[PDB]
């Protein structure tokens, strides 16, 4: 399977929808060359709306499955998406904030790769994905995997600071969240370098976007006093 569980775990109807998506996306491909595969795929997508959504979710799950298949299916999704995958991004948000407790590590890495691809490509609505993924970071915890995930999304945001600049509210969300992470994190030399990177980025955002930081609220001062 994809999500870690056992026999006693409830049969998750969302996961069964994902399994049906696996069935249709894989069995329709049948290991043929990508040309006829995407031809038939576009036919099935344009047949109707629910099957279009099913194909999109199948492509999304394939992006979480295997690296080469993730590359090919992300290519096919960008090629065949009709509405720009906005409701697909909505379902991505739902699956993310609901099933992150059970998500496998390889699926986590491939989902992070998909998030980086979406941010770099500048697909509309990526700000929502960024801020809901940001929301899942638990404060006051020192788990290695969570800290690695925080560092990875921080790297994504730093390389695409201009995409943050064009997203007005995301500036405030990111700076506040990274201040909270700063007051949370300390103890190790790697955490010290991470602290340096975070404080440099936050100071740069605060100076360059002071007017945008005005609407954060008085809790900004609360974070300031501790650092």
């Amino acid at each position: 399977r994809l999500l870690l569980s056992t026999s006693l775990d409830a049969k998750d109807e969302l996961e069964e929808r994902l399994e049906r998506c696996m069935s249709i996306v894989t069995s329709m491909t049948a290991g043929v060359s990508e040309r006829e595969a995407n031809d038939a795929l576009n036919a099935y997508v344009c047949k109707g709306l629910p099957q279009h959504e099913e194909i999109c979710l199948g492509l999304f799950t394939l992006i979480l499955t295997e690296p080469a298949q993730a590359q090919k299916c992300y290519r096919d999704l960008a090629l065949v998406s009709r509405d720009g995958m906005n409701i697909v991004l909505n379902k991505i948000n739902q699956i993310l904030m609901e099933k992150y407790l059970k998500l496998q590590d390889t699926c986590r890495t491939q989902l992070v790769w998909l998030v980086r691809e979406l941010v770099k490509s500048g697909v509309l609505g990526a700000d929502g994905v960024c801020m809901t993924f940001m929301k899942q970071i638990a404060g006051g915890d020192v788990t290695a995997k969570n800290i690695w995930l925080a560092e990875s999304v921080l790297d994504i945001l730093t390389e695409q600071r201009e995409w943050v600049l064009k997203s007005s509210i995301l500036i405030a969300m990111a700076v506040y969240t990274y201040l909270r992470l700063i007051v949370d994190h300390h103890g190790t030399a790697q955490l010290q370098a991470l602290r340096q990177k975070e404080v440099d980025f936050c100071i740069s955002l605060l100076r360059e976007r002071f007017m945008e930081c005005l609407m954060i609220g008085r809790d900004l001062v609360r974070l300031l006093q501790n650092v």
Partner: protein, 886 residues
């Protein structure tokens, strides 16, 4: 990346703001140019069709522009059904503008989706609408679909008949509707029905605009459908003779011009008779000029032969050649020139003088007019007299005489064109008369202080005719020429072109002087070395002019001195080679010239050795040393001929003249080899059938003609000595070395491809590869190459099929030999080969590329690319082999 760029462009489409949306839409065709990948094209067009369906009218028009521009890419659409379905949905919109844009979209897409019935019904419905924009769009789409489909064509033919017959249609829409009928050439009965409709149209709508449009459409229909061309020509002639309007007559002229250019053979004697009668009767200069242009175009084909003496055409041509208007005179004299050259009937020989004198009158008329129309008429007249001289030498003499008489008083541009014509005359016809040379020298003298700007081209053309005229060497007149150049030119480029012409015509001493004078002006390295090499080659060839008949010691001395100068020149030349324009042809040609001269030197040495090394007392094996040396000489000359053939095959880009020159060099090598064989090695085997029409061949150059003459003389000399003497007689060597000095007497002539290279084509020859592969899994290699071109692709040759040959060898054996022929098919071919390697070790894979032209000749042109591959087996196979090797 392709997909990255695609979606980064797509996010602009979704932006909502119209500016970004239309920006992305018009950005799409560039993306197609970057990535001609059918997956990407299909997805992009689906997105285009979606935004076309949902977007506003301006965005739809932008998508229409993109579809029209991206015509070449849309046949690679996979999901044509969905694409056209979502495109077609907009046709139900009440907005007439949207319906018009959709109709235009379908018309653009008609190539990939003909025979689609709902689209046809949509076209048919909109044709009878009220909104003029929608009706015009429907007309355009109907044009496109009728061009593609067949059943739609007859349906629209019927609808257009009943619509034009109807009274609701306005005049302008009727004008727009008629040229739809030009696509009714899908079958005979449909074309005939369209012909009846057009006849009805011209009868019942006699005003200017629609008779114009209708009879032009009938002309195009008849051109496409060849069945009704004679009656169309008859109808056009009828409208030319009867209709009084000037515009209708001029269209008749243009349509007859088109038909003459597209099908001269279909014309009958009656049609030409009618056209000549029309030309005689009409008084207007413009109509006469046009119809005489049509007649002249007809005369340059087989229509004259079908026409046939004194007749209407001859009388018309004679009358028009003396007409006041320049164009009418030009076309008339061209008709006379064509009729004289084409056939040798008695009345034509009687009237050939009339053509010449009329041509002289036109020449004196246009010699000082100095206008672009005058320049065009002068070019026509000069081309006509060049062709006439090529046909009539006894007329060519008087042609040369009048050309020289009018040269002195003509203007500068007229003099340039006259000199070009005279150069052509002299080049094709050898016996021009050295009395020409005095007039040309006198003209060259006075022009030395004529002008500064246009004086340059006149100088180079005059120098060209001087060199072509001087079949023999020069004199102090060359000193006068160089003195005038140094005093007045002060430009260098003209000096370079004059030296180039000198080297072309064999006046190598003049070339040496000019190149030596010109060395200081240059500024680069490779150009300096190139000029120095040309100077040394000219000096080496001027050394060749010192030969005299029957003197063999001085002959060997001159050959050795020329070898010295040639070696210096080739050192300088191979110093001039650079990655940009590597002098490959020049280097190989000079190497082969050096090797040929070395072969002549060794052959002279052997002819001297016949008396210098008497036969041993131990001893046609008596003269053993001479026999062995003649064997070596035959081997060397055979190898030289083979290498000249290799150069010929490699010089695919070269023009006809360069190829003929290289063929002449190879023929000289073969002549010497055959002379050696017949005289020495086996006169019994020399059953030559050389007796024939060899001397009657039409030589296109003085150098070629002299080479063929010496070939014939040497061949007949060899035959007389076939059996008359012992095999190692002194007469054999005497005749042989006489042939050598006779061949070397004529100066080497360079050609276009030595200096100027055109039709530059190469092969990238990409492939799918320091390399190794399992022996059990035999290698499958995919090869593909784009065929580059420079300016005009098919100037001289036209690549008709690429030929690929690949070989395999170890120890770096010919184990994988197969030939494949593949066409460029849009100037980018591809194919694969299957090769096997039974022997474990180092294998070299040599892949060769050859080009087959339209004529069927095979040209060895492309890269001799080679790749190394290692041969090895998998571990477990080797393990079981070792274990079971009992």
């Amino acid at each position: 990346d392709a997909n990255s760029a695609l979606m980064e462009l797509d996010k602009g489409l979704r932006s909502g703001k119209l500016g970004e949306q239309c920006e992305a839409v018009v950005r799409f065709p560039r993306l197609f140019q970057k990535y001609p990948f059918p997956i990407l094209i299909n997805s992009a067009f689906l997105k285009l069709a979606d935004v076309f369906r949902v977007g506003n009218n301006f965005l739809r028009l932008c998508v229409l522009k993109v579809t029209q521009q991206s015509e070449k890419h849309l046949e690679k659409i996979l999901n044509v059904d969905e694409f056209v379905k979502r495109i077609f949905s907009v046709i139900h919109s009440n907005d007439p503008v949207a319906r018009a844009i959709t109709l235009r979209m379908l018309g653009s897409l008609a190539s990939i989706i003909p025979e689609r019935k709902n689209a046809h019904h949509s076209i048919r419905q909109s044709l009878d609408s009220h909104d003029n924009v929608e009706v015009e769009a429907a007309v355009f789409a109907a044009a496109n679909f009728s061009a593609q489909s067949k059943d739609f064509a007859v349906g629209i033919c019927n609808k257009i008949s009943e619509m034009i017959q109807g009274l609701a249609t306005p005049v302008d829409l009727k004008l727009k509707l008629i040229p739809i009928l030009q696509h009714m050439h899908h079958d005979a009965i449909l074309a005939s029905s369209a012909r009846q409709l057009l006849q009805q149209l011209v009868t019942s709508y006699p005003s200017t605009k629609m008779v114009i449009v209708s009879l032009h459409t009938f002309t195009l229909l008849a051109a496409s459908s060849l069945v009704d061309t004679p009656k169309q020509i008859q109808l056009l002639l009828q409208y030319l003779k009867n209709d009084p309007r000037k515009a209708v007559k001029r269209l008749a002229i243009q349509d007859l011009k088109l038909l003459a250019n597209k099908t001269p053979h279909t014309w009958s004697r009656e049609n030409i008779q009618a056209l000549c009668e029309c030309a005689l009767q009409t008084p207007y200069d413009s109509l006469k000029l046009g119809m005489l242009s049509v007649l002249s175009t007809l005369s340059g084909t087989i229509a004259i032969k079908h026409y046939f003496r004194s007749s209407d055409l001859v009388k018309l041509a004679q009358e028009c050649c003396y007409h006041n208007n320049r164009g009418i005179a030009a076309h008339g004299v061209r008709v006379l020139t064509n009729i004289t050259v084409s056939c040798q009937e008695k009345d034509l020989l009687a009237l050939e003088q009339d053509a010449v004198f009329g041509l002289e009158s036109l020449l004196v008329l246009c010699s000082q007019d100095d206008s672009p129309g005058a320049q065009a008429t002068l070019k026509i007249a000069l081309n006509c007299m060049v062709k006439l001289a090529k046909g009539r030498p006894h007329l060519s003499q008087s042609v040369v005489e009048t050309l020289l008489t009018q040269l002195h008083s003509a203007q500068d541009a007229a003099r340039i064109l006259m000199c070009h014509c005279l150069a052509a005359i002299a080049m094709q016809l050898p016996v021009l008369g050295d009395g020409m040379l005095g007039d040309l020298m006198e003209l060259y003298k006075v022009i030395g202080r004529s002008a500064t700007d246009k004086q340059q081209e006149l100088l180079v053309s005059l120098a060209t005719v001087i060199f072509v005229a001087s079949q023999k060497a020069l004199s102090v007149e060359s000193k006068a020429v160089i003195k005038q150049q140094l005093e007045s030119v002060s430009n260098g480029w003209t000096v370079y072109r004059i030296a180039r012409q000198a080297s072309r015509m064999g006046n190598h001493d003049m070339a040496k002087e000019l190149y030596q004078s010109l060395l200081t002006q240059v500024a680069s390295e490779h150009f300096y070395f190139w000029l120095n090499s040309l100077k040394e080659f000219s000096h080496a060839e001027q050394c060749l002019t010192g030969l005299q008949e029957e003197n063999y010691s001085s002959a060997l001395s001159c050959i050795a001195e020329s070898l010295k100068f040639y070696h210096k020149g080739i050192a300088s030349l191979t110093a001039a080679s650079t990655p940009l324009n590597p002098l490959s042809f020049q280097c190989e040609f000079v190497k082969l010239r050096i090797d040929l001269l070395q072969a002549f030197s060794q052959l002279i040495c052997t002819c001297n050795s016949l008396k210098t090394s008497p036969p041993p007392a131990i001893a046609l094996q008596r003269c053993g040393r001479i026999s062995n040396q003649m064997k070596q000489s035959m081997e060397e000359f055979r190898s030289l001929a083979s290498r000249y053939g290799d150069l010929y095959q490699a010089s695919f880009d070269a023009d006809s003249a360069t190829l003929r020159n290289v063929e002449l060099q190879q023929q000289s090598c073969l002549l010497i080899s055959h002379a050696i064989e017949a005289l020495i090695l086996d006169p019994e085997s020399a059953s030559f059938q050389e007796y024939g029409s060899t001397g009657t061949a039409h030589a296109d150059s003085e150098y070629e003609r002299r080479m063929m003459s010496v070939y014939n003389h040497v061949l007949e000399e060899v035959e007389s000595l076939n059996r008359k003497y012992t095999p190692v007689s002194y007469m054999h060597t005497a005749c042989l070395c006489n042939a050598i000095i006779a061949l070397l007497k004529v100066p080497l002539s360079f050609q276009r491809y030595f200096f100027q290279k055109l039709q530059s084509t190469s092969i990238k020859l990409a492939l799918s590869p320091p390399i190794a592969v399992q022996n059990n899994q035999q290698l499958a290699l995919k090869v593909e190459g784009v065929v580059q071109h420079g300016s005009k692709p098919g100037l001289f040759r036209k690549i008709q099929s690429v030929c690929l040959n690949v070989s395999s060898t170890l120890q770096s054996n010919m184990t994988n030999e197969m030939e494949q022929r593949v066409e460029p098919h849009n100037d980018y071919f591809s194919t694969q080969f299957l090769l096997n390697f039974a022997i474990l070790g180092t294998h070299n894979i040599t892949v060769e590329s050859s080009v087959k032209d339209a004529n069927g000749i095979v040209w060895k042109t492309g890269p001799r690319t080679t790749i190394f591959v290692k041969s090895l087996e998998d571990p477990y196979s080797q393990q079981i082999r070792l274990q079971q090797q009992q």
